[PDB]
Paper text:
Clamp loaders are pentameric ATPases that place circular sliding clamps onto DNA, where they function in DNA replication and genome integrity. Because the sliding clamp is a closed ring in solution, it needs to be opened and placed onto DNA by a separate ATPase complex called the clamp loader. All clamp loaders are pentameric ATPases of the AAA + family (ATPases associated with various cellular activities). Here we describe a series of structures of the E. coli clamp loader in the process of placing the clamp onto a p/t-junction.
Author numbering:
A (entry chain G): 121 to 366
B (entry chain D): 2 to 359
C (entry chain C): 1 to 368
D (entry chain B): 1 to 360
E (entry chain E): 1 to 334
Write the structure that this text describes.
Amino acid sequence: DWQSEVEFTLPQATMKRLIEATQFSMAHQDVRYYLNGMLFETEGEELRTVATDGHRLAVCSMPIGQSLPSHSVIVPRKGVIELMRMLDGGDNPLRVQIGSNNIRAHVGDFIFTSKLVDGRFPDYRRVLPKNPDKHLEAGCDLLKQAFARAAILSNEKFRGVRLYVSENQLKITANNPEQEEAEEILDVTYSGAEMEIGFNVSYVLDVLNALKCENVRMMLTDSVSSVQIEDAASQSAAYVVMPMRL
Amino acid sequence: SYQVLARKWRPQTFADVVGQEHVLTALANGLSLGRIHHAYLFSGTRGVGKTSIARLLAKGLNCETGITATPCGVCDNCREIEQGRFVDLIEIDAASRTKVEDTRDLLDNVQYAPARGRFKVYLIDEVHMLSRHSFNALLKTLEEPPEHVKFLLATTDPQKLPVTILSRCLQFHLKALDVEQIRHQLEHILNEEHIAHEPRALQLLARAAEGSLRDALSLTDQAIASGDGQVSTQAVSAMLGTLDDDQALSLVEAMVEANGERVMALINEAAARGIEWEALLVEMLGLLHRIAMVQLSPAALGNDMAAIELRMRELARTIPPTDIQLYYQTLLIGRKELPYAPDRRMGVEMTLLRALAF
Amino acid sequence: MSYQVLARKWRPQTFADVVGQEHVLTALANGLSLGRIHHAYLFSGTRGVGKTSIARLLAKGLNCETGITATPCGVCDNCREIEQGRFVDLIEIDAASRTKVEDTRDLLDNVQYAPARGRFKVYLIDEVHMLSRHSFNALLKTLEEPPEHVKFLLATTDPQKLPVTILSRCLQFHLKALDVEQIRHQLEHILNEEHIAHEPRALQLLARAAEGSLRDALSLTDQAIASGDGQVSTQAVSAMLGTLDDDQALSLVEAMVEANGERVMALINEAAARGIEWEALLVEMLGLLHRIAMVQLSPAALGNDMAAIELRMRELARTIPPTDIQLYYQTLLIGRKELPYAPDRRMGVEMTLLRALAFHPRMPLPEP
Amino acid sequence: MSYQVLARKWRPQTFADVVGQEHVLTALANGLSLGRIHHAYLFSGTRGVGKTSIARLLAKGLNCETGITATPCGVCDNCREIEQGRFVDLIEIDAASRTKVEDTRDLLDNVQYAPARGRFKVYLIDEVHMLSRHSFNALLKTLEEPPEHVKFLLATTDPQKLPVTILSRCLQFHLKALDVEQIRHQLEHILNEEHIAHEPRALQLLARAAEGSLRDALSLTDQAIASGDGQVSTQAVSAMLGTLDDDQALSLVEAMVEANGERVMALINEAAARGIEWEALLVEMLGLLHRIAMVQLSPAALGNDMAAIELRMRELARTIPPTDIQLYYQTLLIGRKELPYAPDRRMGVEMTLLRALAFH
Amino acid sequence: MRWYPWLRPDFEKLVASYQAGRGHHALLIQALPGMGDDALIYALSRYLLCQQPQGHKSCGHCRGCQLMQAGTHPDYYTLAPEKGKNTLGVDAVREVTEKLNEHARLGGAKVVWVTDAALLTDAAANALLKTLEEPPAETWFFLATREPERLLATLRSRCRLHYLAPPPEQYAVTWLSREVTMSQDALLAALRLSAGSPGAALALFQGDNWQARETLCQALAYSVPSGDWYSLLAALNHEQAPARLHWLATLLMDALKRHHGAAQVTNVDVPGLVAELANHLSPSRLQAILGDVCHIREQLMSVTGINRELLITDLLLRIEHYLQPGVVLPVPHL
Ligand SMILES: Nc1ncnc2c1ncn2[C@@H]1O[C@H](COP(=O)(O)OP(=O)(O)O)[C@@H](O)[C@H]1O
Ligand SMILES: Nc1ncnc2c1ncn2[C@@H]1O[C@H](COP(=O)(O)OP(=O)(O)O)[C@@H](O)[C@H]1O
Ligand SMILES: Nc1ncnc2c1ncn2[C@@H]1O[C@H](COP(=O)(O)OP(=O)(O)O)[C@@H](O)[C@H]1O
Ligand code: BEF
Ligand code: BEF
Ligand code: BEF
Ligand SMILES: [Mg+2]
Ligand SMILES: [Mg+2]
Ligand SMILES: [Zn+2]
Ligand SMILES: [Zn+2]
Ligand SMILES: [Zn+2]
Ligand SMILES: [Zn+2]
C-alpha cells in the first residue's frame, strides 16, 4: 500500500552528488531528534538536500528538469547511509518514492526502503547569512592544503583555527592544549576590513572536500555571524559554518 | 491534531499563566530591564508551570523583535520554540542523558555560536537525576558560560541537587496553585471550550488535585471521558469515589464510642459500595477537625452541613479534646501507612481497629 | 544594557577585594612576599566561599610581569587575560572528566614543558575529590615533586574523601563560611556600586537567606532586583523568600502560649488571606520556638536581627519553662511532619495548633 | 632567594639522617655489609613515614663506585644522579599507573637487559598493593629467579591487601609511624638549621597534629612559617590548626556530657562555619557514642582507627555510666529521626543537643 | 493473559473515548494482581493498531491484526524487565524513546505498553516523562500497577487514572465455584485474602500455595496454645514470605475482629483457629504481632537481596518475646 506523494525519476549519479554534498554535515545521536537525518525538499524543477547539526549546514540545490509539487521530508541517518552504501556511479535511472511516512528507492535491480523522522526540519534560508558582503575567493586546493597544514598539530579534543582576514593575505592560526602555534598565509584576493573569525578546521576542511572545484568563494558578514562557503563559479550547493567563541 | 487539556492549554504568554506572580513579575522585569541571568532553575511540584515558564522565558529571550517580556507568538523564533523545532533550544532529559560522553557533548556544543536565535538555550528537565560526574563536570559551564549560552533547569526537588549547583543558578520556587486559582482556571478553560460544568464539580476537582493544575486537568479529562462529556457533580463524585458527610460521620460516631460491630459493618458496607479508602480517611480527618473546631468555639461550625449539625454538636460536646486529637493522629498515621499495607481495605481496617482500642 | 551578573562582574580580582577568609589571604600574601611558594595547594570549603576566585588571584600574583608580589600587583597583560578567562598560565581542569588514570597520565606527561609568556603553568584541578584512587596515586609522584614551572592548585568541598597520602603533600587551607554581616556588607557595596536603591531590612533578610556563601547571596540579590525595578525593598525581598511578617507568627505563638483559641483563629484566618504558604508558617513558628529555647540556654543566642521583637523574645523566655517549650516544639514538629497527609494544608496547620492548645501544659482546653 | 619547599629540600641523603626506623636501618646495613642482599625488598609503612626515602638510599648504596655498602660516599656520580632524580636505570614506577597486565609485562621485559650504569638495575614501585592480581603473579614469577644484577624495591601504605605469597619472594620491612618526640626533634633540627624562630609548644602542636607522619609535620611547618612570617609562635600554630580542626563531633560529645551549654553552642557554630553536613555530624556522633559503649564493655573494642583520640575516648568510657550513654544515644537517635522536618538543620541539631543537655 | 467476563464494561468505557478521538495518550490502569489489566491493555492496543475497527473490536484478520497475532508488529511496543531481573532499566525505555521518534511503520498508531509501572526504575520513569507529557502524533501509552501511589508523582501526573473495580463478592464466588470445586468457605478465604481479586484466588488455588496455607494453619494450631511460634519457620520460609506473612497477619486481623465482634472475617475456613487466637492472646499483643508481621512483610517486599530466613526467624523470636507477660508492646507513631 503506497501513495507516492512525490515521485522522482532522476539519474542516480545526480543524487549521489546531492547526498555526498551534504552527508558529512549531519547529526549523530544528537539530542535534537529531527537533526538525526537529512531533509529532502522539492520546489518545482529543483531538488534540494539539506543537512545540519547545529554547527554546520550543507544545502545542495540542483535542477532536475522535471516539475514536482513543493515538499519536505526528513530521512534518518541510517537510511541515507544505506543508500550511499548501495548507490554506485552508474547510469541506472533511479526512482524515488516519497509518501507520508516512508522513503523508497527503485535502483536498477535493487529496492531501498526506510521510514521518515516525524518532525519539521528547520528553515535553512534564515540560517544563511542575510548580508554576504565580504568575499574571499581563492583556489580550493590551496585552501585545502593550507588548512591541512595548519591542522597538523591540532588535537582531536581541541580542533579549531582563527582566520585573520586582511587586505590580501589570509592568516590561519591554530593553537593546542600543549600551547604551540601554527600559522599559514595565503594570497587570497580580497578587499575589506581586517577581521578575526574562529571555526572548527575539521568542518571547513570537510566543506572544501565536498567542493571539487578550482576555486571557492567564502561570504562573510562580521566576526560573530556564520560564514557561507560556495563554488566561485556555481550556485548549486552552499555551506554554512557557525563561528566558535574565543 | 487533537490535544488533551494540559498541552492544548499550555500558557503561551506571561498573561496566560495561572498564579506564580512572584516569579512572573521578576521574570518580566528581568527581561525588560536587561538584567538576565545565564542559569535559571524553576523548582516546584508537578503541574505548576516550570516547563511552561521556562518555554516562555526562552521565547522572550530570543525574539527577533528584541528581548521582550511579551513575546509576539507570530514570529519565526516564537513559533519554532512553541513547536519545539528550534535548534538553539536544546531540551534534554537528565535521566536519559547522564553519561560522560553526553557531558562532553554539552561542553563542546556550548562553544559554537547559535544557529538562529540570539542565545543558545539549554532546557534540562529533572536535573537532579544527573550523575555526580555530570554535575561536577558541568560546574564551570553554569558558572561562567559563553556570552551566548543560557541554561534553564527544572527539578521536582532541589534537595537532591548538589548545593554547589544551586549556588550558581537563579532559584524560582513555584508555589502549588491554590484551590480557587485552580477552579477559576477550570471554569475559564471549560467556558472557552464550550463544555457544560457545575460549580460543585469544579470544587471537587480542584480539591482532589493537590495544588497541581496538570492533575486538575487530567481529572477533568477523566470527567469528560465519563458522563457524555459533561463536568457534573454526580460524574465527578463517581470518578473520585467520594462520599458525603453522612457516612463518615456515622463511622466517626461509631468509632468514638468503641462500637466494634457498627464500625466493622460500616467498613464492610463501604467496601461493598467500592468507595475510596483514602477518601474515607480524608473525610475522617476533616470531620474530626470540625469536631475540634466546634469544641474550641461554638460558632466555628460549618453552615452547609446544617442537617447533620445536631449529632455533630452533641459529639463535640461529649468527647474530650485530647481523645479527638488522639483519633486524628491515629487516622493520619493510618493514612500515611495506607499505601504500604498488604491491602488498602486491610490497612484502613488496621487503623480503625487500632483507634477502637483506646 | 547588559548588566553582567553580579557574580561574574563582581568576582574579586585582588586580595584587597576578597571579604573574609583572612587566614588564606594572609597565608598567600605572606608566602608570596617571602618567596616560599609551595607547589601544591588545597583550598577546601563549602560552595561559594571563594576557593576558585582566590586561586585565580594567587595565579595572577605568581605571574605578574612586574614581579613576584603578594597581591596581584599592577595588572599587566598576564593578569588581565587571566581575569578575562583567557589562558596565560591557568590550566583549569575539571576532575570529573579525568577521574580515570588513563587521562591523569596524559595530564602528567604534558607537565614537563615550559610555560608560554608565564612564570608558571598553574594547574587548577577543581573538585579534586572526584578523582579515582588510581589517579591519585598516579599523580602522587608529580605532586611530591613537579617541575619548577608547574604549580598545583586543588580546590574541593569535602577534604575527607581525599586519601591521606595526597593530603600530606599539599598546603591545606580551609575557607570558613562568611558571616551574615560580611554578606550584607558586600551586597551593600554591590548596590552602591550599581546605583540601585536599597533598604537595610531587605539586605539583612537577603544576607540571612544566604547560608554563609556570597554566591547564593548574589543570586538572591539578582532575583530581588528582578522582583523590583532596579531596587530592592523589604516587600520585594519578603515576597521573594516567602517569609511572613514576624508580628503574625509571633502573635500566633503568643496566643498558643496564652491558651486562647479565638485569638489563634483570628490570626490564622487573617494569615490565610495574605498569601503565605502554611508550611512556612509552621516553619517560622518552629524557628521562633527554638529561638526562645536558645534564649533560655543563653542570652548569647538572640540574634543581632529580630530586634523589633527581641523584648518579647525575652519575655516569653522568662515566662515559659523549658519543658513547655519542648512540648510545643515537639507538637509543632509532629504537626509539620504530618501536614502532607492532612486533608488540607490550612486544615493541618489549624489542627496542629489546636492540638498544642488541647495538650497545653498549664491551661488545657476545658473537657466535659 | 630560593625559599624552596622544606619537604624535599630536607629529604635524607645518608642513612644517618633518617629519623626513626632504627631496626630497619640496622637490618639494611647488616645486609649491605656482611650478608648477601636479598633479591627483593618490600617496604610498608604509613603516609610520610620514610618508605621511598629508605628505598632510594638503599638504591644509592647498591650502585656506587665505592661498592655495595651502607654509607657509600658523598657527592659521587651515582649518588648525585639519584638525588637529582636524573638516574637512568633507577626506574621509578607508580603501580596505579601500570596496573594493567600488559604494561606490567612490558615493564618486566626490561629486567633481562643489563644496567646502563652502576652495578644493579633497581626498580622502585610505589603503592605496590594496587597492582592487579595477574600483574602481581607476573611480578612474583619474575622475582623467583631474577638476574644476578637486577633488584626490586616495593612500597605500599597498606600491606594487608598484598597476598601472603609476596612474603615467599621478598623480604619485607615495616616502618613504625613516628611518635611525637622524634617528629618534634627532627622539626626542631630543621628549624634550627634553617634559622627559623620557634617555640617548643608550637613544635609540640605541629607534631601532635602530624599524627605520626613526618611529611605531614613538614607541610604543617611550611604553612605555619607562611602564615607567621617565619615567627612560629604557639598562638599562630594553634589558630591555624583550629582553622583545620575537624574533631567537632568528639568535642560536642565531650561538652554535651559535661553539660556545658556555651561550649556546645560555640562548637556547633564553628561546625556551621565549617560547612559540615548536619546529618553526617549526627550519625558520626552516634558512632562515637556507640564506640564509647563498646569500649566500656571491653577494652579491646577500640582499634587503630581511633588511635589519634584514644586517650579522650578511654577517659570518656571510664567516667560516663552506661545509662547516660544509652540516654544520650536515644536522644540523638530521635533527633536524627526528627531532623529532616525541623527548620534549617543548623538549629535542629542545636535543639537535639539541647534535649541531650536537658538530662542534667 | 486471559479475558474476564466482568471486565468488559471498563473496556467499553475506554474504547469509546478512544474512538471519539478524545482519548488520553497515557492511560494508567490501577488494578490488583489477577484483576485483568493486561487484558485491557492488550485488547486496547489491538484495537488501536487495527486499521478498520469493527464495532470497537479487533476485526479478525486485518494486516494490523495479523501482525498483532504474530507478535511482531513494528509499531507495537512492550516494556518488560529481562527475565533474569525484576527492574526496568534506563536503556530499555531509552531505545523505545529514541525509536518512537520515527513515523509509524504501517502509517497507523504507535502504541506502547509498560507491563508494570511499579517495576520501573526512577531513572526509567524520569526518561519516560518527556514522551508521556508530549508524545508525537498518533502515539498512545498504557501503564499498569497494583497501586498508583507507589508510582512517581510526576509519572502519574501525566496519565489519566482508570480504576478496575473488583467484581461483587457473590459474583466472584460464583466464578470461583465455576472454575474450582471446593467448599464456599475456602472460596471466601481466597477472595478476602486476595483483596477481592478472583484471578489471584485462581492463582492461589491452582498452585500448591493453598496447601502451604493449610500447613501454616496446622502449625498455628500447635503454635498458639503452647507459645512455640518459632516452629512456624518452615511454614513461612519458602520463597513466598509476603504471601505467608499476609495470611498470618490476616489471621491475626480476624482474631482482632473476633474481639470487637464482627459479622464478617477473612479466614472463615478456620473459625476454630481464629477462636484460639482470640482466646489465648491479649488484644494488645495481637496488635503488636500484627503490626510487626506487616512491617516485616513490607521489609521483605522492599529490600532486594535480603535474607528471608533471618528476617522470619527474628520475627518469630520477637513474637515469642511479646508473648511473655510484662513486655512493652510497640505502637505505630509519627
Ligand atoms: N501556572 C499555570 N498556568 C496555566 N496552566 C498551567 C500552570 N501550571 C501548569 N499548568 C498546566 O499544566 C500542564 C503542564 O504544565 P508544566 O508547566 O509542564 O508543569 P511542570 O512544572 O511540572 O513541568 C500545562 O500544559 C498547563 O495545562
Ligand atoms: N571571599 C569572597 N569575597 C568576595 N566575593 C566572594 C567571596 N567568596 C565568594 N564570593 C562571590 O562568589 C562568586 C563565586 O565565588 P567562587 O570563588 O567561585 O566560590 P568557589 O570557592 O565555590 O568556587 C564570586 O563571584 C563572588 O561574588
Ligand atoms: N624517616 C624520615 N627521615 C627524614 N625525612 C622523612 C622521614 N620520613 C618522611 N620524611 C619526609 O617526608 C617526605 C616524604 O617522605 P616519604 O618517605 O615519601 O613518605 P612515604 O612513606 O609516605 O612514601 C620526605 O621527603 C622527607 O622529607
Ligand atoms: F511535572 Be513537572 F515538570 F514537575
Ligand atoms: F567552587 Be564553588 F563550590 F562554587
Ligand atoms: F608516600 Be606516602 F605513602 F604518603
Ligand atoms: Mg516540566
Ligand atoms: Mg610514597
Ligand atoms: Zn516573537
Ligand atoms: Zn600583572
Ligand atoms: Zn656514592
Ligand atoms: Zn484489524
